[PDB]
């Protein structure tokens, strides 16, 4: 039941892990519009390269804005390996919940692929506080989108003030990290 | 532990319930920056009037964008609330994920706002209301922003705001589910 692992109606903003041979993480929206979940991957990214080669991707639900930003620009010790068929596949140690997916029906449009769930897990250890809407966290999320597009600088500058007004220390540090990264 | 009930560092966007004698709900940001949480209420609102008289307010954590927009632009009906416990009961939302009843203290005017610190009196969790895992969704986030800009459009009349609402409608349509798309329709109807 994908809903329990954060894969929900609309576009769920998660951190996608890929790379059996070298783990990689990057924010990705998984889309759910009534049928199988699917992804639309910008061509050229390591996520795109990994899905083409390996046809596997895992979702990682993350509420930490620092992790979102660091993954927009993670080292192997940050990943753990979980069962994906007879292979093991990297997910984030700090994931609240993960689902490993086989990527199917690959088609260029970006690269689009539908997702078939292989295995899923929940990390009780990782939920310490109750999630609550925070416009500062939302602002960091909008900044990472523009950062990725930039890879826009003017736009990132605006979100900074919302992150500073509404964010906690973690949102403020994440926004600092974006500024440093570019 | 307030973080267990959704009162976290920074400004937590919740729906505040107030009104011993007639329950009222409205989106409000509770601010936490190292000490007691506090609220900055715009003068003249129903939440403001109830805090002034009663000095009590409850946070309600809500992930439903429909309830956000309805509480912003409408009156929730008394059947949407339930009563929880010092002496006297106090209204919280039945659809709240988690609620905290606070005594409002140190009421002070600054600017065109009433500021109050918050001392928790009681708190609860509604297991029954968590059915899916929360996940960041830019459509939900767009609904939140659109509600802010819509209130400013009512302020100020500026077209700058209708243009922003249209951009957020676009994200709600792309990224949201059915609930977000319904929420945006309610914003439009309200305007
Ligand atoms: C919140 C957010 C959502 C994103 N969603 C997608 C997406 O669904 N598809 C995509 O290709 N890129 C998406 N991106 C952009 C990628 O995260 C970005 O290009 C990333 O840095 C690629 O890194 P990689 O080469 O390691 O895969 C998103 C970025 C942000 C911050
Ligand atoms: C996301 C969001 C956050 C808000 N935060 C506050 C706030 O913290 N303080 C405040 O006075 N009004 C805030 N508002 C505006 C009130 O929600 C709005 O004026 C509401 O209509 C008040 O209704 P009431 O008269 O029933 O109190 C916020 C609105 C939105 C949509």
């Amino acid at each position: 039941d994908l809903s329990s692992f954060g894969i929900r109606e609309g576009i769920s903003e998660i951190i996608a892990s890929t790379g059996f041979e070298h783990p990689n993480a990057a924010p990705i929206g998984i889309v759910m519009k009534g049928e199988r979940p699917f992804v639309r991957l910008f061509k050229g990214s390591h996520t795109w390269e990994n899905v083409l080669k390996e046809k596997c991707l895992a979702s990682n639900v993350v509420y930490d804005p620092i992790l979102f930003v660091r993954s927009t620009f993670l080292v192997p010790s940050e990943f753990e390996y979980v069962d994906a068929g007879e292979f093991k596949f990297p997910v984030l140690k700090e994931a609240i919940a993960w689902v490993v997916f086989e990527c199917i029906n690959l088609r260029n449009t970006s690269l689009v692929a539908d997702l078939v769930p292989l295995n899923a897990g929940f990390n009780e250890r990782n939920i310490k506080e109750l999630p609550v809407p925070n416009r500062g966290f939302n602002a960091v999320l909008e900044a990472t989108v523009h950062a990725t597009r930039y890879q826009y600088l003017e736009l990132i500058r605006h979100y900074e003030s919302l992150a500073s007004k509404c964010g906690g220390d973690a949102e403020k540090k994440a926004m600092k990290l974006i500024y440093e990264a570019l």
Side-chain angles (χ1 to χ4, degrees), chain A:
Chain A
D1 176 28
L2 295 174
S3 280
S4 322
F5 301 94
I7 307 311
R8 290 178 57 186
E9 185 188 355
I11 303 181
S12 309
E13 307 289 345
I14 53 72
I15 295 302
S17 54
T18 56
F20 175 85
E21 292 181 19
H22 182 246
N24 182 257
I28 288 305
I30 295 200
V31 192
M32 176 93 77
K33 296 303 199 179
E35 53 183 31
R36 291 184 186 281
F38 72 94
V39 287
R40 187 171 317 256
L41 302 179
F42 290 168
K43 296 183 186 193
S45 72
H46 263 53
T47 306
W48 168 82
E49 186 182 333
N50 291 336
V51 168
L52 276 173
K53 188 177 129 153
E54 297 171 5
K55 262 69 164 182
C56 193
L57 173 155
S59 62
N60 298 270
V61 170
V62 158
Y63 302 138
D64 177 15
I66 293 176
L67 223 41
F68 260 94
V69 167
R70 290 183 62 235
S71 78
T72 298
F73 312 106
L74 269 38
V75 294
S77 52
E78 295 192 72
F79 300 81
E80 66 174 344
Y81 291 78
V82 301
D83 300 338
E86 272 139 300
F87 255 23
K88 286 210 178 289
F89 194 80
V91 302
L92 277 58
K93 285 193 168 120
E94 304 312 314
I96 281 91
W98 52 265
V99 184
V100 182
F101 294 103
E102 176 178 355
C103 300
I104 72 165
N105 297 327
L106 273 59
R107 44 199 194 273
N108 300 309
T109 337
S110 311
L111 166 75
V112 173
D114 306 312
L115 296 181
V116 180
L118 293 180
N119 188 20
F122 193 79
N123 291 318
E124 297 75 30
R125 66 212 180 73
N126 288 338
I127 324 195
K128 307 150 149 80
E129 307 188 355
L130 179 67
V132 66
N134 179 286
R135 288 175 73 203
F137 176 91
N138 302 349
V140 175
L141 181 60
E142 293 305 308
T144 71
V145 166
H146 305 122
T148 286
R149 307 244 170 94
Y150 171 71
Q151 284 175 238
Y152 287 113
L153 323 91
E154 297 204 308
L155 204 44
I156 291 159
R157 296 197 167 126
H158 166 244
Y159 280 109
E160 188 283 330
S161 43
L162 214 39
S164 291
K165 288 180 156 300
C166 294
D169 280 3
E171 286 77 24
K172 293 178 186 193
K173 170 62 164 297
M175 192 63 53
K176 189 179 304 134
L177 253 22
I178 296 182
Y179 273 49
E180 296 186 353
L182 52 96

